């Protein structure tokens, strides 16, 4: 049991991006969910239950689909949003949960 | 409004034993499953282990953690990981983190450093 994300993005400041996001098993029940981490700081819920977005969050921050398959877009970046973003999914009986390896953002000039 | 804070994190040989501790405010274990996931140096996060919701919760842990670490519930507000065997590659900041809703981990503590060297 694995999961994915892209390597190093970069995007420039209304701009949009997409994260995506494997996993080798289809998750249980709808579980999964997403974090942004800013440097010496500890993670932030994003999105849980694959589309739900968690307390205070923009709805410039949308995450998609089903599976397997996920995808987080940002629309209207702004600069602090330059940031690590994780995956996380629930499975099934001891592997219960699994993070990613983490796709760091860089925001660049328009 | 509710947090959760580590402690005890420590500069410990190769080979040695160490405790770590969250503790709760503003909840209970009751009603939420607890995590402990880690970050190693230039690393991502790693789920550890989890135990679940009220007294007789289940426990689950990641393949790899299986043989050298316990997680537990002392209590209704303290939960407990058990680092036994402990290599240079453990190095990492521990973190406890609360199962909010279906998966999200709605709130972490800030961590605790463990130093695993010579």
């Known amino acids: 049991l694995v999961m994915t994300q892209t390597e190093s993005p970069v995007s420039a400041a209304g701009g949009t991006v997409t994260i995506k996001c494997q996993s080798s098993q289809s998750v249980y029940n709808n579980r999964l969910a997403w974090y942004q981490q800013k440097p010496g700081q500890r993670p932030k819920l994003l999105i849980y239950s694959a589309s739900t977005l968690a307390s205070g969050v923009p709805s410039r921050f949308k995450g998609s689909g089903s599976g397997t398959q996920f995808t987080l877009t940002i629309s209207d970046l702004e600069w602090g949003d330059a940031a690590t973003y994780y995956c996380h999914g629930g499975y099934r009986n001891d592997d219960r949960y699994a993070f990613s390896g983490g796709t760091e953002l860089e925001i660049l000039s328009s | 409004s509710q947090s959760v804070k580590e402690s005890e994190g420590d500069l410990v040989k190769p080979g040695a034993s160490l405790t770590l501790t969250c503790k709760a405010s503003?909840?209970?274990?009751?009603?939420?499953?607890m995590n402990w996931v880690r970050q190693a140096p230039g690393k991502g996060l790693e789920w550890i282990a989890s135990?679940?919701?009220?007294?007789?919760?289940?426990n689950y842990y990641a393949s790899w953690a299986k043989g050298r670490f316990t997680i537990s519930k002392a209590s209704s507000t303290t939960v407990t990981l058990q680092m036994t065997s402990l290599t240079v590659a453990d190095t990492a900041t521990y973190f406890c983190?609360?199962?909010?809703?279906?998966?999200?981990?709605?709130?972490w503590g800030p961590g605790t450093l463990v130093t695993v060297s010579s």
């Open positions: 503003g909840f209970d274990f009751t009603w939420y499953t």
């Open positions: 983190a609360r199962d909010g809703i279906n998966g999200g981990y709605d709130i």
């Open positions: 135990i679940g919701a009220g007294v007789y919760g289940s």
